[PDB]
């Protein structure tokens, strides 16, 4: 009879439109288990992300709202596409679950990191990640959690970013929320953050792609800092000064480190043959690597700079790279405290709009 239905996936219940069929578990977001599904109507695979009673908490509601808002507003071929949203509940009183339907790519980067890319591919993927990020920044939005598993590819070599639950404007104003291995110094050390925090993440991702494995493993949130300095060497005192004193003391206390050169961090052995023409060179990759993986955010290259970089700009196209900003209605401001129930209200209104 009715519009929705139900399937047990392990201990999770998916209640979804009858159009969606054959659900399979695939992964998680900050919030959400996610299923792959057939959309019998549109006749294509999709991804359904269940957000479970997200109003149950400041956190969950904050993240859910953003994710709802940003997914509606964002539009770029390198951001993952909105397709549908719904709740199966029939009212603000009944309400508990949100569901988001998105396009399904073929794989996340996990994945590619292991295979051995030629330069044109490696540079192309980066270029696509960056246009994606420039799209968010373009509107003041920082992704904060870029990592191989938030970046999805397809076998035509296209690429999109994913999961906006973490996404907000600039820093300070909780610490262990961004994935450990991709944490920038400004995040490890508690000093707050600007858009180029995303650039640090890209640097790590690129590094891994080449490295074959995680660039700064780091066995806990503190060792993490060791890995960073073990490699890049001890930041400047100019830098340390901006460190809060409690943390400043620890840092200044570490064994000093010269740090390896990028040629040593990233030898030729590791790179493919150099490509047909000029800018896709192992050394150009190094140069770029060296401008992203910089401890001091104020000496770190931006997205627009990164797109300009000779290794990335060989694909440069203004209609991808200088699109119109997603438009955020000044209502939603990624920070406000609401309540227990002001939240349940907001999301509902927002899902309601979107159904």
């Amino acid at each position: 009879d009715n519009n929705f239905y139900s399937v047990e996936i392990g201990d999770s219940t998916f209640t979804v439109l009858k159009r969606y069929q054959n659900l399979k578990p695939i992964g998680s977001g900050a919030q959400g288990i996610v299923c792959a599904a057939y959309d019998a109507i549109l006749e294509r695979n999709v991804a359904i992300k269940k957000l479970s009673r997200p109003f149950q908490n400041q956190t969950h509601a904050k993240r859910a709202y953003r994710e709802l808002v940003l997914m509606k507003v964002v539009n770029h071929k390198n951001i993952i596409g909105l397709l549908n949203v719904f709740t199966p509940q029939k009212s603000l009183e009944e309400f508990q679950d949100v569901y988001i339907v998105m396009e399904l790519m073929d794989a996340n980067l996990s994945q590619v990191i292991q295979m051995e890319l030629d330069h044109e591919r490696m540079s192309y993927l980066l270029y696509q990640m960056l246009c994606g990020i420039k799209h968010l920044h373009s509107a003041g939005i920082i992704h904060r959690d870029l990592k191989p598993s938030n970046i999805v590819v397809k076998s035509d070599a296209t690429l999109k970013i994913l999961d906006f639950g973490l996404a907000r404007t600039a820093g300070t104003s909780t610490p262990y929320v961004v994935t450990r291995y991709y944490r920038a110094p400004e995040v490890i050390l508690g000093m707050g953050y600007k858009e180029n925090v995303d650039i640090w993440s890209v640097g790590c991702i690129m590094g891994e792609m080449i490295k074959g494995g995680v660039l700064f493993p780091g066995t806990d949130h503190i060792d993490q800092w060791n890995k960073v300095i073990e490699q890049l060497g001890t930041p400047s005192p100019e830098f340390m000064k901006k460190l809060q004193p409690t943390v400043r003391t620890y840092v200044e206390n570490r064994p000093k480190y010269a740090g390896y050169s990028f040629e040593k961090l990233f030898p030729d052995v590791l790179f493919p043959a150099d490509s047909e023409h000029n800018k896709l060179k192992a050394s150009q990759a190094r140069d770029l690597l060296s401008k992203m993986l910089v401890i001091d955010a104020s000496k770190r290259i931006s997205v627009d700079e990164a797109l300009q970089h000779p290794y990335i700009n060989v694909w440069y196209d203004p209609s991808e790279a200088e699109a119109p900003p997603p438009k955020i209605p000044d209502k939603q401001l990624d920070e406000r405290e609401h309540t227990i129930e002001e939240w349940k209200e907001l999301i509902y209104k927002e899902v309601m709009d979107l159904e």
Binding site: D106, E120, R121, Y124, S155, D156, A157, L280, W315
Partner: peptide
């Protein structure tokens, strides 16, 4: 320099 159009996820 052409954009690749294949990517092997075998």
């Amino acid at each position: 320099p052409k954009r690749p159009t294949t990517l092997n996820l075998f």
